[PDB]
Amino acid sequence: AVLSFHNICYRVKEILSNINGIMKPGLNAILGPTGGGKSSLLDVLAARKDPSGLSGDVLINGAPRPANFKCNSGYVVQDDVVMGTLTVRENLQFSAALRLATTMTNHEKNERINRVIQELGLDKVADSKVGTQFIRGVSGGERKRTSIGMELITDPSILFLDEPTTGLDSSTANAVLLLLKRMSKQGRTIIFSIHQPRYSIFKLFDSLTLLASGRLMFHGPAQEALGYFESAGYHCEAYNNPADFFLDIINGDLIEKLAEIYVNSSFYKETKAELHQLSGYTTSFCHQLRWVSKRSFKNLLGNPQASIAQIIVTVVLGLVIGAIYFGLKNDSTGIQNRAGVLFFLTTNQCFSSVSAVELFVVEKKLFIHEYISGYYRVSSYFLGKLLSDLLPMRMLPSIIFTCIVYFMLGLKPKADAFFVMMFTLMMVAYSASSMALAIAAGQSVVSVATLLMTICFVFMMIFSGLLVNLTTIASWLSWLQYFSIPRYGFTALQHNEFLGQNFCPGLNATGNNPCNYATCTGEEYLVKQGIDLSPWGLWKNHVALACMIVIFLTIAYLKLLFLKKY
Amino acid sequence: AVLSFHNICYRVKEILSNINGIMKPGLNAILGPTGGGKSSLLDVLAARKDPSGLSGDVLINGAPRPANFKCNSGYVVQDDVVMGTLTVRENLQFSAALRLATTMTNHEKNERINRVIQELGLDKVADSKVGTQFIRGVSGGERKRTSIGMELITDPSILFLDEPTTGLDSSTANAVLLLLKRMSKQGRTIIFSIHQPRYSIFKLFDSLTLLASGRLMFHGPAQEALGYFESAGYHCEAYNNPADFFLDIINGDLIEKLAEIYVNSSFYKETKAELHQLSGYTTSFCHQLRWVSKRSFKNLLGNPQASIAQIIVTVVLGLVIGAIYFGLKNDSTGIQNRAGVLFFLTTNQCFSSVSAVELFVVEKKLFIHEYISGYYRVSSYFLGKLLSDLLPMRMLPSIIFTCIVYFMLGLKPKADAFFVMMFTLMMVAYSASSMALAIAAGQSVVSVATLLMTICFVFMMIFSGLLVNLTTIASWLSWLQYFSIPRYGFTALQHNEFLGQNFCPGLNATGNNPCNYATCTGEEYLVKQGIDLSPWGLWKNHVALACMIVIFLTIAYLKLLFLKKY
Numbered sequence A, B: 001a002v003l004s005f006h007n008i009c010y011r012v013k014e015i016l017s018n019i020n021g022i023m024k025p026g027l028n029a030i031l032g033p034t035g036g037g038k039s040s041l042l043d044v045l046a047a048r049k050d051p052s053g054l055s056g057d058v059l060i061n062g063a064p065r066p067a068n069f070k071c072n073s074g075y076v077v078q079d080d081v082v083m084g085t086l087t088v089r090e091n092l093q094f095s096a097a098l099r100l101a102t103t104m105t106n107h108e109k110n111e112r113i114n115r116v117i118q119e120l121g122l123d124k125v126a127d128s129k130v131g132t133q134f135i136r137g138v139s140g141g142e143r144k145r146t147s148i149g150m151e152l153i154t155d156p157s158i159l160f161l162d163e164p165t166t167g168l169d170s171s172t173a174n175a176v177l178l179l180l181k182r183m184s185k186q187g188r189t190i191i192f193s194i195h196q197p198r199y200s201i202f203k204l205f206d207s208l209t210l211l212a213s214g215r216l217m218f219h220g221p222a223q224e225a226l227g228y229f230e231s232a233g234y235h236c237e238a239y240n241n242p243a244d245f246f247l248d249i250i251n252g253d254l255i256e257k258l259a260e261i262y263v264n265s266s267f268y269k270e271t272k273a274e275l276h277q278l279s280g281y282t283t284s285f286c287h288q289l290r291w292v293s294k295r296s297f298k299n300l301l302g303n304p305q306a307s308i309a310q311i312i313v314t315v316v317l318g319l320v321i322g323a324i325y326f327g328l329k330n331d332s333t334g335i336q337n338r339a340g341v342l343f344f345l346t347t348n349q350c351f352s353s354v355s356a357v358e359l360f361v362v363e364k365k366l367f368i369h370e371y372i373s374g375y376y377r378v379s380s381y382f383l384g385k386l387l388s389d390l391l392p393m394r395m396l397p398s399i400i401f402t403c404i405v406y407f408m409l410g411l412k413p414k415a416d417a418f419f420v421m422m423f424t425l426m427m428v429a430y431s432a433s434s435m436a437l438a439i440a441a442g443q444s445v446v447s448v449a450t451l452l453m454t455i456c457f458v459f460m461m462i463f464s465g466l467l468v469n470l471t472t473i474a475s476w477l478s479w480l481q482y483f484s485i486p487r488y489g490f491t492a493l494q495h496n497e498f499l500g501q502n503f504c505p506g507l508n509a510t511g512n513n514p515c516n517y518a519t520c521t522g523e524e525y526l527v528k529q530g531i532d533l534s535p536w537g538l539w540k541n542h543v544a545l546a547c548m549i550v551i552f553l554t555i556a557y558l559k560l561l562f563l564k565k566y
């Protein structure tokens, strides 16, 4: 299975102008600087770029590239897109779990996992965690092998590598490059964009194609490259590295004048003659939903440095709130006291979900690469992570909260009120996380995602039934009370709270009482806040919060789905 | 003026083990990998490392290095430590302004600024801004020249360069390296740690010293380097770069076995013979305070992208608060309304000073390099930046705040109360910025500095006279009300606010009124909050905030002063 390409015109400014040539089923390479069209060529030959600006055709052994070309052809990304806090065994099981289980059994596909672990030579650390900047594990030289080995389980005919020696301890860099020479013995087409090979792997090159500023310099084998520029006009004598002299022509010891000599060279004309003669999902839904939810859950308690950080600051917050309000009295200092704390617990939960923005952006390149390679549909990924790293995570600043705070105060001595308060505190937390997830899903940096959300949770903090008394502002702006998350929190936390008790000792003020502006009963206080006293009015917020969840989640589901993934 | 060095033993593990050798008043170089003792040698030869682990001696032309060796010897740092948003002219004026004005006039030192701009060749873009990742300006090839030219105004005998070709568009890299060859024609000792020269500047090397894993490989001139390893055992034939073959011996095509041949080589023995024969502030305070305050002030409105961002979100916040509370009534819904907003304005100002942590950490390497080179004392830098980027910056979320909010509510229709509220809102803002400055000065990353401070401004948010009613909690924890910034805000903002008005229409409740729990008068409300009613009790917070400022600023002044600056 060979690749070939003819007259590629690519506009965003034409970035890939006049590229054409063939490959060989061996070890191909893309050379040149990073400023040129070197990296942009390999993306278009791997169908990574969009076909909008594409004009030329890529012919694999004469046939055009089919729709599932990206399903069968692995593309190793430049950075470590391996999961850092996972075992290398189950790291390799994951990519095997979504591309292959349509027909074959589990114990049928187990053998090719054990096959690719030995031809990679990765049985040595096969039961170790990979390692990241947070936690250690397997060394960085074998992190690239895990990226390469991950894309070998489904059967490849072409294999791509995006800059495979970017900072790989060059004494260790050669071993993986010999392995690709060892991988090409089966017939794997290895097209990579290598960044400055010195001389060692430069003699083990089967074919090469050097580019500069969007212009083809030269295509040909490495044994034919040394005799080229000596017959072109710039000499490369002794103590002059070949792969670094070939870029010295565009340093200027002009930009197109070197590229013309290749047209009337004895390399390009016979590639045109062979170009002219060749010119004339897969896995079930519930199988996908399990496995991606298995990964992030294992990723969560594989690195429990930021998960248990939220638990401890919650348990210490609840004890501190419990130590502050250790027994709340029904005196005149009750209303300022119990509406104060029940304000605080919602707007904590609305604000402590600032750290829900790091859910789709710390693994965005883990999402774009795994979606476009064909692992799963988007709604499988999105439903997978929510019930794995938003549902069990944001369910315990809530049920851990009430049990440590409601018994240290004695808010309302019941069990339904203990069970409705526990319900709504996890309901705000699911909302304002998703609100923070809505305006942060499908972005690259967390920077403007935190600044935009935090200034949005201030206007929600104002309209919350505490700092305003919403009934008193004018109706041309009091419509903004509905566009606020913790108001639905604070109302629901108050409606189950002011129902039977009297903040008026020594007197009773039900219907016959003089001397108003008293606010003795809480039901008198609630109409000062204008809260309706119906039992519908309690659950009116929860459906309003539940419909706040759905519109915020599907706009996040839209934003990942309509993401420019090329 | 030549440098020499003998038997350097350096422990943190011995990192610089057995280094010795001489220099030449020309162009010296330090070679090897980044993993070795290459970068750590140049720091010790520039007196950048601490002399704690140092054992050997560095002899400059036989004399030991004096105390003000660092005053006369420039050290160019690896990254661009030039000020990005400043003009190249005034960028070069700055370093001239602090090292030279002790005797000579301003118009005497102006000539050497015009002298070093032409021998650098930087008159072409001399009136342009430098440029950063935020705003453009002079291209990145001439950013390194501005770092080099900055350390030339005071007269150098030795000049250091920390890795001067780290990503400098290698076609442009040669021009600055020829300039150092052109600079060495005067007699400037140029010792740099160059990272992988290919061949071009490798022939323009006067002396070189290659190191590996803390072991000296070889010291000598570049013309004597090519004949070394051919007479040592590993051959470097044609199409083999010399500077990359010299590191290939430690790749292994062992770690000390190559380093032994240098001991019985004809290079080291005659350097020992010459080593054995050589073996036997400045500127006023107020002149320093002006110039550093001129720099950051010019840096502030040189990049007014984040300065005017805070102004607009302030003016839009004040209009929104003004639109919400457009006329606050003296009904029963006054106390919840006016204590609500006056809670919000303090805890905004306490929280909106989260962005004061980026004051000593976005330019920390701009501080360590400029302190140790001898530009100023620390208290000059610390008093310089506060009245330039904390005092005029955090004075206008306050006086811009009251004028847009006090007239849209009519809080207390006076002019003293307008002038005490404007005073205290800038007093909280100066406090909680410095509180955020205290636990962030002298750190490298803003990450744990934001997480620690924001969870600290929650416990200050609770004990604030709103969510607690501080008089009702037990005295074993109510001592924590004093360790909270905006309580002093909220009390002082309330004491000038509840003094003459009555939230009790149709009745008067001064001393003769039945039907308690009424809170008609505000002075009755203040003793429900337990605020003392003395006019001392108003200003009691401001001195408590002013003494909060001093202890937080001098712990920041201590933290910069006792910083490990080696």
Ligand SMILES: CCc1c2c(nc3ccc(O)cc13)-c1cc3c(c(=O)n1C2)COC(=O)[C@]3(O)CC
Binding pocket: A344, A347, A348, A351, A352, A354, A454, A455, A458, A461, B347, B348, B351, B352, B354, B454, B458, B461
């Ligand atoms: C409810 C406690 C609470 C708050 C904030 N953050 C938290 C974070 C974690 C946590 O557990 C509890 C938090 C926060 C932030 C800000 C303001 C504010 O009132 N609060 C309150 C005012 O407005 C601002 O600009 C902003 O600084 C936004 C950055």
Ligand SMILES: CC(C)CCC[C@@H](C)[C@H]1CC[C@H]2[C@@H]3CC=C4C[C@@H](O)CC[C@]4(C)[C@H]3CC[C@]12C
Binding pocket: A482, A483, A540, A543, A544, A547, A548, A551
């Ligand atoms: C795109 C973003 C802003 C959508 C915001 C969602 C909010 C504004 C929408 C979604 C669901 C809606 C709520 C669902 C139904 C009810 C119950 C009714 O008795 C009061 C209005 C109320 C509470 C609606 C108010 C507006 C609402 C809360």
Ligand SMILES: CC(C)CCC[C@@H](C)[C@H]1CC[C@H]2[C@@H]3CC=C4C[C@@H](O)CC[C@]4(C)[C@H]3CC[C@]12C
Binding pocket: B482, B483, B540, B543, B544, B547, B548, B551
């Ligand atoms: C190291 C950090 C925690 C220091 C914190 C500064 C605070 C806690 C210190 C510094 C200055 C001190 C205040 C200065 C004087 C007064 C006025 C007095 O009538 C009440 C106590 C009060 C208000 C002090 C309380 C404690 C205080 C506020």
